[PDB]
Amino acid sequence: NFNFNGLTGTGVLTESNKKFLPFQQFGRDIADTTDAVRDPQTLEILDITPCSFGGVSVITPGTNTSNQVAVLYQDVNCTEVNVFQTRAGCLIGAEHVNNSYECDIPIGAGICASYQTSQSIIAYTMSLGAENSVAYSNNSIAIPTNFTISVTTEILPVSMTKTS
Amino acid sequence: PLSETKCTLKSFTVEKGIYQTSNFRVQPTESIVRFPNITNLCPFGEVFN
Amino acid sequence: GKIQDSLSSTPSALGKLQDVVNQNAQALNTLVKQLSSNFGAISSVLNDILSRLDPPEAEVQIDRLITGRLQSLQTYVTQQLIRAAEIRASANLAATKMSECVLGQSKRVDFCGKGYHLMSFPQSAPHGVVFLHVTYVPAQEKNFTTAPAICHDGKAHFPREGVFVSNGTHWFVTQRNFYEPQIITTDNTFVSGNCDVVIGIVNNTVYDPLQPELDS
Amino acid sequence: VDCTMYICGDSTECSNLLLQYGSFCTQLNRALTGIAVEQDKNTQEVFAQVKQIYKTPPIKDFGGFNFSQILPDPSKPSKRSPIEDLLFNKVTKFNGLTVLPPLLTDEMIAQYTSALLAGTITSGWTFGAGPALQIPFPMQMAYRFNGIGVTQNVLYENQKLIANQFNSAIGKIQDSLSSTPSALGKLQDVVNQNAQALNTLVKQLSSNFGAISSVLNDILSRLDPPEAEVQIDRLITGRLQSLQTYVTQQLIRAAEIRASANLAATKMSECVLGQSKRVDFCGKGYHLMSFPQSAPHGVVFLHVTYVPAQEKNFTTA
Ligand SMILES: *[C@@H]1O[C@H](CO)[C@@H](O[C@@H]2O[C@H](CO)[C@@H](O[C@@H]3O[C@H](CO)[C@@H](O)[C@H](O)[C@@H]3O)[C@H](O)[C@H]2NC(C)=O)[C@H](O)[C@H]1NC(C)=O
Ligand SMILES: *[C@@H]1O[C@H](CO)[C@@H](O)[C@H](O)[C@H]1NC(C)=O
Ligand SMILES: *[C@@H]1O[C@H](CO)[C@@H](O)[C@H](O)[C@H]1NC(C)=O
Ligand SMILES: *[C@@H]1O[C@H](CO)[C@@H](O)[C@H](O)[C@H]1NC(C)=O
Ligand SMILES: *[C@@H]1O[C@H](CO)[C@@H](O)[C@H](O)[C@H]1NC(C)=O
Ligand SMILES: *[C@@H]1O[C@H](CO)[C@@H](O)[C@H](O)[C@H]1NC(C)=O
Ligand SMILES: *[C@@H]1O[C@H](CO)[C@@H](O)[C@H](O)[C@H]1NC(C)=O
Ligand SMILES: *[C@@H]1O[C@H](CO)[C@@H](O)[C@H](O)[C@H]1NC(C)=O
Ligand SMILES: *[C@@H]1O[C@H](CO)[C@@H](O)[C@H](O)[C@H]1NC(C)=O
Ligand SMILES: *[C@@H]1O[C@H](CO)[C@@H](O)[C@H](O)[C@H]1NC(C)=O
Ligand SMILES: *[C@@H]1O[C@H](CO)[C@@H](O)[C@H](O)[C@H]1NC(C)=O
Ligand SMILES: *[C@@H]1O[C@H](CO)[C@@H](O)[C@H](O)[C@H]1NC(C)=O
């Protein structure tokens, strides 16, 4: 918590590269939030970045399979908090495995989690599907010789309960 | 964390997935009151001395 | 039968309708809970405010409750109007799907389920509709060599329906979605141009059904 | 947006006063979470229409059709086509307002559009319905022409001309997007409206709403509880009304974006995974094919259509 000459508020003060004019006492961001201050005794410019915060999300398989969970602290470092730093946040409790698989619990920024054989929670960069290549060539065509009839189910809501 | 998830979902069974259960903050450690340097001190000298 | 097993086994199959029920229930449950909030008033229960305070100040606390509960209703109604717009969009989609998949055979790709649409069946469901979309999916395929055209007398014959395929030694013409080779004849192909323009034309023999009859 | 940090950030007295309003903040957080989830559903529905990731061969002989301006450029750092690079280069957490990463990052979305392009190019529309069945591109176009009532021979006899017209038209797309600032207004408007909504929401913290000061600590540092609570309730009402306005506007805009995403998913299904016969659905003319490209917060389709150009007066019967 800082009080620079009646300007008040919580944050982390760090050494800045900003060049205030001799008479300006505090830098303000685009939307009128204080971004930097002049320390009144040593006339140096400090940036104010707000104190780290974010949601805490619990990544779990179901309580029908396991009571082991991983916790994601969103959009922060793994210093303020088997710890895996991801773009989505700091993931604690999941193991990092490089081989990709289909996303099971999405975490974010490409990272998904799952419960796999240990039999532990893992995190990985999701696979988008099995890779393929169509054996293209200028004189070759693939033609089906057999077929299946499939039935798919499309479920749509039509109405709400008529509350009055 | 698992009990927090159960309380958030109001259930003793939690389905597979990711659930937001709380909000983490980094609490202010020190209250720093830093202020300008002290100059133009009032002429109590003359009156008193 | 697989649809029956699929829908029964996983309970989540109808989540798209269950969510709507849940959201409406949550929408009302919150609204009912909002009656217990003070919104700054001395008590959330109106009858204790009237029974405890004289008019000039009880009216102030009651106005505080009126603002809070009216704003709560405005929130509920706004959320219901937006959710109703979502459901209206779903209902309009369902009516379009009923028109085009059930009352017809849609040619809109993936409108009426993956594959090539053959037909659909509605089924009712609480607060919504479930369509069983019956589609044709090609399932086994083979590598054939192909050509855009064939040369027979210097004229280029192009298939009238389907494509030319080769099983390695012979050329056939076949319907594009199901391997069914036919002998290439003048009733399977049409003639346009000649051999010196088409890139990829291959030499072949086109059978003329009339000649055997004229000799016979 | 964290309603409690936004309204009553790092103030216990204010938080205790906010708790007298019951469910308003949990409801706002729930609505914003629902929107945030929906945006990943929107991206999934638009782009994850292919189960497998298809690739074109190293041989690019497609009968003269030059797709090098839509196909991924391996040389660059993020495997994007040049047109995708123009689109990305052409589009421009404090108080509890935070931004979540999208589930599918730009590289994965580029991979999905690459899979869709390789599928379209090497198997026509068959990768959409079922197994992706290879067909030579000039034969795919022969089907695409036959699909609009133009006999196959028109492509084959005019293949070189058609391939050159296609390549020229794509180059013109490159120039059109490159030189005109306004081509991507539809996505820039979305970015701008969200930025304006959040700058407005943050600026609302500076309003008094009838209170002596917009700064919560200056009320707490000046006034004794029984009256500072009145001023704080004034600020809570104003700031909560500000969040309700923001969230309602976001819900309505999200409904608009959902409609756009549903249209984009329909267009990918019917224009990219097939050959639409819906007039002006897949651009003016008669639809032959279309190509997805990723773009920040949206999708750009290149619709390739047949337009008659020169005509003659015949007598008929
Ligand atoms: C009236 O005059 C007297 C003496 O001239 C003042 O008293 C002096 O006050 C100063 C205040 O800074 C004292 O200085 C001290 O010096 C020591 C070491 O020299 C240092 O460690 C301290 O931190 C402090 O700076 C000084 O000792 C003291 N002298 C006496 C005899 O009291 C008095 O302050 C004057 N009147 C007013 C109203 O100031
Ligand atoms: C206040 O005193 C310090 C000595 O520690 C000095 O360096 C500083 O310059 C003074 N204040 C100003 C505004 O100069
Ligand atoms: C999940 O729960 C069902 C009953 O609800 C049970 O039959 C099943 O065994 C559980 N799953 C596992 C992996 O045990
Ligand atoms: C914060 O995270 C970045 C990477 O996201 C890392 O480079 C940096 O060292 C971290 N800082 C702290 C203090 O943890
Ligand atoms: C892949 O996983 C192994 C652990 O088995 C690890 O040593 C290696 O560094 C990982 N590769 C990368 C690129 O992180
Ligand atoms: C086609 O598949 C069915 C089962 O899906 C099989 O019974 C039938 O023999 C197959 N036909 C051919 C020609 O392979
Ligand atoms: C067609 O041939 C390619 C290689 O020439 C092969 O990868 C592909 O599996 C073949 N198609 C089928 C249906 O086996
Ligand atoms: C057969 O193909 C050759 C090209 O190698 C061509 O010169 C010849 O004219 C073709 N035959 C006929 C009957 O067109
Ligand atoms: C191709 O089909 C013809 C039918 O006329 C048959 O005689 C020939 O043996 C077949 N060749 C192959 C490789 O299947
Ligand atoms: C196909 O490409 C090969 C080279 O890979 C070339 O020799 C041949 O002439 C081409 N054929 C057609 C029909 O384009
Ligand atoms: C057209 O294709 C050729 C390869 O055949 C390639 O070298 C050229 O760069 C392509 N055109 C453009 C504008 O990239
Ligand atoms: C067809 O005839 C009309 C006469 O009314 C003329 O205006 C038009 O230009 C003619 N079209 C062409 C293509 O010459």
Author numbering:
A (entry chain C): 540 to 620, 641 to 676, 689 to 735
B (entry chain C): 295 to 343
C (entry chain C): 932 to 1147
D (entry chain A): 736 to 827, 854 to 1078
Show the paper's wording.
We demonstrate mechanisms through which the SARS-CoV-2 receptor binding domain (RBD) can tolerate large numbers of simultaneous antibody escape mutations and show that pseudotypes containing up to seven mutations, as opposed to the one to three found in previously studied variants of concern, are more resistant to neutralization by therapeutic antibodies and serum from vaccine recipients. We identify an antibody that binds the RBD core to neutralize pseudotypes for all tested variants but show that the RBD can acquire an N-linked glycan to escape neutralization.
(A) Cryo-EM structure of the C1C-A3–Fab SARS-CoV-2 spike protein complex. A3 binds the RBD core with the spike protein trapped in the three open RBD conformation. The trimer model shown was generated by superposition of an RBD–C1C-A3 Fab model generated by subparticle classification of the RBD region onto the coordinates of the trimeric spike protein–C1C-A3 Fab complex. Although the A3 and S309 footprints on the RBD do not overlap, and S309 (a class 3 antibody) can bind the closed spike protein trimer, both antibodies contact the N-linked glycan attached to N343RBD but approach it from different faces. A recent molecular dynamics study suggests that introducing the glycan at N370RBD in SARS-CoV-2 would favor the closed conformation with the N370RBD glycan stabilizing the closed RBD structure on the trimeric spike protein. A lack of a glycan at position N370RBD, therefore, may increase SARS-CoV-2 ACE2-binding and infectivity by favoring the open state but may also make SARS-CoV-2 more vulnerable to neutralizing antibodies that can only bind the RBD in the open conformation.
